[PDB]
C-alpha cells in the first residue's frame, strides 16, 4: 500500500482544439486527445477509435531502436509488478506542459461506459462537458495549470490482471488473446489547447499471487 | 518412513513413499461454496468427479536445460474425454468453480542427478509461442506436447511477426522464471523425492468461471537442474501427474460444447 | 514484499562456455581454490536474477541474514564434504582454505539430506547497508562467500565424475529492506 | 538552534530548457541547473556530471581577484561554523530572480540516492516529474514565483562534518582527501525557464565539538 | 540421525554427519583458571583465539601399515602464522596454559576399508627419528610431513650413531603402540564415521607452560587397519583436523619470539 501510494508518470495527452468545440478523436505523433486509464500499455490498436490496452510496447521511432515508446503506460508499474492481480482506487493528476494559461475541459468515463463522442447539443459549448459523467473544467490566470482527483475502482471485474490475461474477452474467442475484458479504470477525454502529462497514484493498493518481475539484461 | 503417504479421492488413491508433505497454496483450500453470482442452485458434491485423473506428461532427457518447462492448463487439461464425469459435467455447464489437488510423479535412482520445479500459477500464459499467430480456442489451452524453451518468455511473446518483434521490448505474458519459486510450489529432487504434492484454492477475476474462455490455473513442471546419469543407468525418465479437481461446483446447466 | 525475498531463488553460475547455469560442478579432487565465490552484495551479478535481488533493486538499504541454499544433485552413491565460508572484508578475499576457514564457516557433509542452508551473518559497521553502488564502499560491499572442497567427492564405479550442486539465495529470518526506489533502467533482451 | 533557524542565501540555480522536455545537466557562467544540498562549497569538480562538494572556494573571474565565487555555499555558515559536526533538518526556499510568470518543476533527490538523469518515458512531459522522489511543480499567474519546503536529514552518516573531514571516502583511498562520503542533504534538479536563488534554514540545529572560526584579516 | 553434530567456537563451526560422540580425556575440561604460579593477572577470554584452526594433515594410501602415524605437536602446530590471534598472542607471552578440542576428518566410501586411531597423548615424543642428530628447537616440535614408520619406536630411539645403537636396548622415548589405545582416543572406521571428536584438559609437570621449550600435548593419527579399495574407487583419501585451544590463559607478556 505504501510503496504504490505515490504519483508516477503514466501517460501523456494532447489537444489542438478549443474548449468550445466538438470533441473529435485525434492522433498526432503518437499522442491522442483521450486516454485509457490503466498502468499497462495502451495505444490505438488496429485503428481503434480510442486507445485500447496493448499487449506489447513499441518504440515511437521506426529507426532509433530507442525510447520514447509509442504506447502509454506507468513504466514503474510495468517494470515492477511482482503480482498477478491487483485492486485499488486511482488518483489521477493532469499537468499542462507549459506555462501558457490553461483553458481545458476533461471528461472522465467509468470503466466500460459509453464514450459518447457526440456533437454539441448547443453552439459554442465544450461537448465533453455535455454529460453527467464526472468532468473537470479549469481555466484562468488564477489557476495553476493542473488537475487532480481520485476515482474509485469501477471495473466489473473483482480484481485486475497486472500483466497477462491468459484468455479472450468474447464468446467467439476472436478478441486479442492476452487482454482481459474491461481491465481498466475508465478513460479521460480532453479538449482545449495544450499537451498534458498524466500521473497515477494507487490508493489502498492490494495485490494477489506473486509472480516474476520484468527481466533485466545481464550486466 | 513418515514419508509414506496415501491420499484417497472417490474411487482413486495416490501412494508415494518419498513425500516431503503437501503444500497448500495461499494456505487455502476450495471449500466448495456456491458462487454468490448465480441464482440457480449449483450442482456439487459429485463423487464421480471428485477424484484423481492421472496422465503422462513428458519424457525428461539430458537435453533439457534449466527453466525448460511443460504447461498443463486447467481445467482444460481435463475437459477432454479422459476427464471422466468431471469433464462430461463441465462440458454441460456454463460456469465452474474449483480448486486443485495435484501430485506429479517422476522416479530415477540414487545414481541419477537433477531436479524439477513443480508449481501452480494463476493467469499463467498457456498460449503457443512457436508462432506469431493469434492464439485460438483450440490452441490456447492445450497441455504442452514438447518441452518449452525458456529464453523466449523472459520479456514475453508478442503475437506479431519477427520484424515487428524488434520494436516490442515487453509483452504482458512475460514470465521471469528466476522468480517462479514465488508461486506455490515444491521441488522434485531426484536424490530426495519421486513425488510432489500441491493444492491450490479457487482464484479468478470473478466468483465463478466461464471456463470455455478462461484457463485460470496452470500446473507447470520446469527443470531446475539438468538430468544427469552415467553409461548403464536407466535412460528413460518420465514425468506423470495425478490431478484432482477440489470440490468443483457447477452452474448454468445447458447443452454440451463441441 | 519481504515474503518474496525469503523464497530461495537461483544464482547464476558460469558454465565452461561462459553460459549461465543454476549450479556448479564438483568431482573426485580438492582444488586449492574455491569452487565458487559470491561477493556479498545484493548487487552481485551472481544473484542478479534471484527474487531477492529483484526486490532489493527497488529498495535503498537492507539489514539482516542472507540464506545461501545448496542442493546436492549428484548420485545417491556419491559422498563428500564442502567447507562453506563467509569472509568479512578488510583483509581482502581469502586466497587459501587456511584463510577461508579462519572466518565464518560451516562444513557441509553429503548424505541422506540433500541440501545445506547456509547463513551469511549480518556483520556490518553500519546498521543498514546499501543495495547497490557506483563504486564499492564499506557500506555496500560486505565480503565474500566461498565454497571449498574439503574432501573430494567420492563414489563407486559406474557413476559420472561430475556432480551438480544447485545454488540459491534469499533473505534470512531477520532480513529487511527499506526506502522504495527505482533501479537503473535497462532495455530487456 | 535559534541562531541557525533562519533562512540564509546558500545557492543559485539556472535553467534554459522548458518544463516539458528532458532534463540535461548544464553549466552557464558557473551556474548549473541542479544543486547539491550542503552549506559547504559545492561545484562541478573535475568535470563531474553534477555538482559535488568542493574543498576550497575560487573566484568566478580569473582576473578580478574579487567575488562572486564560482562555488556555491552558505557564506554565513562557512564564515561562522565554530563546530566540527552538525545535525539538522533543512528548510529550502527557491525564488525566481525576475517577475516573469514562473513555470518550473523541481526534483528533490535524497542524500546519495540515484539521480536518474533518464529520458522522458512519455512525450512532452517534464522528465524530472517522472519519479516518486519528492518533486514540486509551480506555474501560473496565481503563483508567487517561489517554492519552500522542509526535508529531513537523509545522510547515512550520524552527523555531518561542518568544515573538514580528515579522510577518504573509498576503500582504495583514491577519493579527494578532505571530503566525507555522502555528507549532504541530497540534490535539487530544476527544469523550466529562469534563474533561481536558494536559501537554507537549519531546523532543530545541533552542533558538536567546538572548533576555530574562519580567520579574518588584521584591521 | 543423532549423528549430525555442529560445534561452535568463536567465528568458526565444525559440522559432521557421522559423529560417534565427543570423548573427554580424563573426563576433564580446561576451565581457564589462572595459574597460581603467576602474580601478573593473566590475559584470557580472547574470543579471537578460542576458535577452531583447520589444517590438512596427510594423504592416506594403501602403502601405510598398522601403527604408521602422523604427529601434531601442541601448541606448536599452531604457533605459526596460521595460528591467527591464538598464535600472535602466544608468541608474545612467556607462559600459556590450555586444553584442546579437536576433530580429525577423513572420508572415503561404503566400498573402502580401513581404520585410524585418533588420540591425544601428554609427553609424547615428537622429535625426528630419521636421524641420530640431537633434536633442536626447530626440528623437535614440527607437524610430521610424512607418515612415521612404527618399528623404530617400540624400544625408543636414541640420538646416537647406528653402531652405538647396538648397545642401547631402550630409550625413554619408547612407545609401545600396542597400547596406544590407553590414551584418550577414538577410532575412525571408514565404514562407520568420517570424523573423531576429542577434548583433553591441561596437564603438565607444572601450573602453566613455558611453551617455547615444551610441547606437552601431541595429537596422533595412526592407521590400525590398512586402507583398501578396488579398481575404480576414489584413490585420493586425505586426513584433516580442526584444532581448538580450550580457554587458553596467557602470562608473562613480553616482546615476540622469532
Residue numbers in the entry:
A (entry chain A), D (entry chain A): 34 to 82, 89 to 188, 191 to 260
B (entry chain C), E (entry chain C): 11 to 268
C (entry chain B): 44 to 232
Task: Give the published text.
Human Saffold virus 3 (SAFV-3) belongs to the species Theilovirus in the genus Cardiovirus of the family Picornaviridae. SAFVs cause diseases ranging from gastrointestinal disorders to meningitis. Cardioviruses have nonenveloped virions with an external diameter of about 30 nm.
The formation of SAFV-3 A particles can be induced by heating the virions to 42°C for 2 min. Here, we present a 10.6-Å resolution cryo-EM reconstruction of the SAFV-3 A particle and show that it is expanded 4% in diameter compared to the native virion. Capsids of SAFV-3 A particles have pores located approximately in the middle between the 5-fold and 3-fold icosahedral symmetry axes at the interface between two VP1 subunits related by a 5-fold symmetry axis and a VP3 subunit. The pores are circular in shape with a diameter of ∼15 Å. Models of the capsid protein subunits determined in the native SAFV-3 structure were fitted as rigid bodies into the native cryo-EM density map of the A particle. The formation of the pore is caused by shifts of the VP1 subunits toward the icosahedral 5-fold axis and of VP3 toward the icosahedral 3-fold axis relative to their positions in the native virus. Low values of density at the border of the pore indicate that the EF loop and C terminus of VP1 and CD, GH loops and C terminus of VP3, which are the located in the vicinity of the pore, are flexible. SAFV-3 A particles do not contain pores at icosahedral 2-fold symmetry axes. The RNA does not form any contacts with the capsid of the A particle, unlike in the previously studied A particles of enteroviruses.
